[PDB]
Amino acid sequence: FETNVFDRTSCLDINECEQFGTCPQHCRNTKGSYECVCADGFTSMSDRPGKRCAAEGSSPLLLLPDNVRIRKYNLSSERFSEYLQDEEYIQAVDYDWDPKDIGLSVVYYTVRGEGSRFGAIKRAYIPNFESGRNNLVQEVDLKLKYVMQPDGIAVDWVGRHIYWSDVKNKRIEVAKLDGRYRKWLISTDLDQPAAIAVNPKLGLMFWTDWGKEPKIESAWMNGEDRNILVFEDLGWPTGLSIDYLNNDRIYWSDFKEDVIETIKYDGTDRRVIAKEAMNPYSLDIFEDQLYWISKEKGEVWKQNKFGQGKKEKTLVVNPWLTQVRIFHQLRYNKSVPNLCKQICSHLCLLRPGGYSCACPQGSSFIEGSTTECDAAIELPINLPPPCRCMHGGNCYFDETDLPKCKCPSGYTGKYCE
């Protein structure tokens, strides 16, 4: 347009990281250039610019909470391995990876009540190693009362807290991992809340209310600060996901308007990743791909997380399917440290760049102190020892009710290692 090579603004150091989808995981500003790089545990499939990142570990699985079963599907092996059954009304799932450093992992799912029968939130041990019904699974109810419709759930691995939402209660209640102390951190100005995600690194929790006022909020993990990221053209924003690897960007799916979009952590840059997903109901992002469930046909669809490429059908589960969660170690980065210093008496919720003490609902801090509450200290509750038979071994309980393994000829050891 003009020979003004230096008209106030000229060709110079350009932060290409600002451009959307410049790099899958980590982009570094370079003078008139960029430096695309993966993260720990991720290796490059291709050249440095726009390098695809592959998880340096076991193949990722997709936990699929059907109405009566919670089966895990190994993406690479392209097969279904059954984990849970005989239950009913399972709505949302999430996992804490390895809480106790053992092979197994704890998975927190939700059960919605019908009629008089109240719902409940339950946890049990999912084995990270391949194992179907050979290992008996013992569901453990968190014994949370007054659970009406636990639509969504999320796990705070850093804070050891479980965040869940209830449509009927209209309260985003948080509690300890075993449910010792339960708090209503928002419990206000909510109309039909929905799937919730938590970001310990930013100390921010994100939820959606597909109710009359379609909104997506980004309140503090302790709930001190609350604000609405987006409130325009949201329809039914059921389903949410945080791309912790890439700028902690937020992605949501619009069931009513049949469109899947994304926003920044502050909700500034709003973009449409894909359109016409046939009413997506849940999302999850791993590496460079985003998966969603078209609840109508219970089908899984994948596409490039930056909106490139095309949607690809992968699986067709029963219509009952309600959520898709990508079960992998690197999905929930466990490197983030805990700022809590066992100062709070009962609960230590997280907040952006810090930690704040809280109290269980129905209790208050003792006068003059912000660390001790008035309620009693409930003893910790832990899960019973889980079946650990690794390679197809069948677990049997002894006279002491201790899980022992009928190890096969293929392997050996206490857990058929």
Partner: protein, 158 residues
């Protein structure tokens, strides 16, 4: 009487006409009851607004405010029986340790209306003689005055 209902008319105001040519008072319309067998009264019914002493269930049904945590789940959706520990209670009711409300009259009456039986175990013996059962009844650990005939009678009522 029922022959000419097709020809029979209804009152212009305060009367609802059903598909069966049935005239019913306008108040009975949308009362949750099929005043006329054709259910025309309850065919299209937006839920009514609850009054001052009425709790609104998630089913958009109004129930008496005394029925919140009634310990009988009067509302179908069971939304009434929630947050009973954080609900305190009404001035004229006693709150069980479980958090539910019960009539203060039914306290220490020998009838464990509360599921946890706190309504009966929080009071001393019904007489200073040293027992809770006046009519030679059976007093379990929950201090419930199970009738002497009902003592060890089939199912464990206490």
């Amino acid at each position: 009487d029922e022959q000419g209902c097709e020809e029979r008319t209804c009152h212009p105001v305060g009367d609802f006409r059903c598909k069966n040519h049935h005239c019913i008072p306008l108040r009975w319309q949308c009362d949750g009851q099929n005043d006329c067998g054709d259910n025309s009264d309850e065919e299209n019914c937006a839920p009514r607004e609850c009054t001052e002493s009425e709790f609104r269930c998630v089913n958009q049904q109004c129930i008496p405010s005394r029925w919140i945590c009634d310990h009988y789940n009067d509302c179908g959706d069971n939304s009434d029986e929630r947050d009973c520990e954080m609900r305190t209670c009404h001035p004229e009711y006693f709150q069980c340790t479980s958090g539910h409300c019960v009539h203060s009259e039914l306290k220490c009456d020998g009838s464990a209306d509360c599921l946890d039986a706190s309504d009966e175990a929080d009071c001393p013996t019904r007489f200073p003689d040293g027992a809770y059962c006046q009519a030679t009844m059976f007093e379990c650990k929950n201090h419930v005055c199970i009738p002497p005939y009902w003592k060890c009678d089939g199912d464990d009522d206490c």
